[PDB]
C-alpha cells in the first residue's frame, strides 16, 4: 500500500477498454495514453526527475524510448522498447532493455525486465485504469532503482555520457 | 480538443 497508491495517484487514470485491434476505440485509448504520458513527464520535469522519454509508430502498437539513471553524478542512458499486446489493456506490455540482456538475473530472454510480485496482480485488478504511464512508474522505474545500482557496483555497465 | 497527431508532437517536442 506504500509502494501502491503513493505513486499511482499522481498519474490520471485511463478509461477506454480497448486494444490495438479496436479501430475507433483504440484511437480513443491511444489519445488517453499520450495525455497520461505527457502529464507524467511534466510532473517529472517539475520534481526535477525527468527520467524517461517514449514514442510509438503511427498505429501506437510499437513503443521505443530511453530512460536515464543518475548515480554519484554519473548519468546512464538505456534504450527501451515494447509491443502492445492484442489483449491490452488487460495484458500489461513487456518492457525490454536490450543492452542489459545477459547482465542481470531479473530479466527474461530478449532483455525483458522481470517485475516485483506486486505488479502483475496490481495491474490485473485495475483494468483498464492503468496505462503506459503506470507501466513506467510502477514497472520500469522500481526495476531500474534496484538493478542499475547493482550492475554499477559490479562494474559491468559502460558509462557513455559525461555529466 | 486535440488530435492524435497533436498529442504525438506534444510528447515528442518536450
Numbering used by the authors:
A (entry chain AAA): 3 to 165
B (entry chain FFF): 170 to 183
Text lifted from the article:
This structure reveals that the UBS adopts a helical conformation that interacts with UFC1, mainly via hydrophobic interactions. The UBS forms an α-helix and interacts with UFC1 on the side opposite to the active site surface. The UBS residues L394, L397, M398, M401, and M404 form hydrophobic interactions with residues V29, L32, L39, I40, V43 of α-helix 1 and F54 and L56 of β-strand 1 of UFC1. Accordingly, M401R and L397R mutations in the UBS prevented the interaction with UFC1 and damaged UFM1 transfer. Besides hydrophobic interactions, the main chain carboxyl oxygen atoms of M404 forms hydrogen bonds with the side chains of UFC1 K47 and R55. In addition, K400 and K402 of the UBS form salt bridges with E44 and E57 of UFC1, respectively. UFC1 possesses a pocket, lacking in other E2 enzymes, in which the UBS fits spatially.
Analogous to ubiquitination, ufmylation is carried out by a three-enzyme cascade involving E1, E2, and E3 proteins. The E1 UBA5 has three distinct regions: (1) an adenylation domain that binds ATP and magnesium ions; (2) a UFM1-interacting sequence (UIS) spanning amino acids 334 to 346 that holds UFM1 in a trans binding mechanism; and (3) a UFC1-binding sequence (UBS) from 392 to 404 that binds UFC117–21. The adenylated UFM1 is then subjected to a nucleophilic attack by the catalytic C250 of UBA5 to form a thioester bond with the C-terminal glycine of UFM1. This is followed by a trans thiolation process, whereby the UFM1 is transferred to the E2 UFC1 forming a thioester bond with C116 of UFC1. However, UBA5 does not harbor such a domain but instead has a short sequence called UBS that is responsible for the interaction with UFC128.
